[PDB]
């Protein structure tokens with residue numbers, strides 16, 4: 228239980244400058260102070276260590292958003308979307324290596340692909356519901372179907388925050404991505420040509 | 421573009437419609453093109469190199485199409501015809517598009533190829549935004565390059581999700597209207 232934390236902390240540290248494939252099971256066992264076979268009391272494989280790390284990061288975001296879902300709407304409509312987008316920016320930005328490794332594994336692991344697909348569907352669904360609620364109150368024009376607008380905005384964030392977190396080029400500079408995304412959500416959700 | 425080289429590339433693109441590159445053998449490619457296996461290795465060293473040539477061909481088709489409309493309306497239409505170049509070019513080659521995106525995690529050439537063209541299309545977008553600012557048609561909100569980067573990355577992710585049939589995704593029939601709406605509102609809107 229205490230050695231299990233050691234294995235996860237070692238994996239997250241090692242993933243910062245090495246992909247999971249360049250990480251052996253012996254690597255994690257040494258990092259945790261245990262023999263290699265003793266690892267398998269805690270985890271069936273290194274893939275399961277990544278899955279546990281990703282599940283905790285994803286659920287950290289999920290609980291931070293749901294905390295905002297249960298509490299009154301902010302007088303300031305720009306700031307309500309900024310606070311939601313910032314959960315993603317801060318949660319995943321605090322676990323870049325796991326975020327990166329998680330994205331790579333979406334191609335190879337049905338568990339990872341399902342975790343990420345399901346999380347994105349959940350928060351796209353929530354975004355569509357807030358937009359539709361904004362229309363019902365007259366705060367937002369009835370332009371595009373809410374769920375399609377919400378999907379594209381959420382897909383932009385996934386791609387743009389990942390590009391920023393991985394240091395890719397092209398990419399928005401890290402200190403600027405929050406303002407950039409918020410501007411595009413707010414104008415596309417509240418404007419009409 | 422040798423006559424047998426085109427048969428290899430056409431066979432590859434056909435087979436990629438329903439099978440990933442990993443389920444396609446060199447023997448699959450040779451037989452489809454009506455050639456021997458050594459003939460195959462006369463033109464390509466690997467099936468990955470076939471994919472790279474295929475993707476290089478569609479990427480550059482989109483680019484050329486984009487430059488000729490740059491070489492030449494209504495505001496919404498400008499951005500729509502521009503976005504449509506990518507929706508139509510990559511939409512006419514969904515198999516190569518799907519395989520191209522998968523190979524970006526394994527092939528540095530594929531990665532660098534895509535990255536180089538995205539930077540070019542992003543810089544182009546920023547300059548057009550800048551010129552709509554210069555003539556007073558667009559407000560000076562975010563820096564043009566940052567706005568251009570998030571919008572182009574949106575299109576990349578959203579266009580791939582449709583062509584790859586993912587969930588979540590925007591239905592193919594609605595992706596152009598969706599993206600056009602977000603561009604024109606975010607480029608021309610303030611507050």
Ligand SMILES: CC(=O)NC[C@H]1CN(c2ccc(N3CCSCC3)c(F)c2)C(=O)O1
Nearest residue numbers: 498502503506510541545548572575576579
């Ligand atoms: C499938 C894929 O990945 N596409 C990549 C990007 C490129 N791009 C893009 C670039 C330049 C413009 N121009 C066209 C003339 S007018 C001013 C804007 C444009 F509309 C769109 C996208 O939206 O997707």
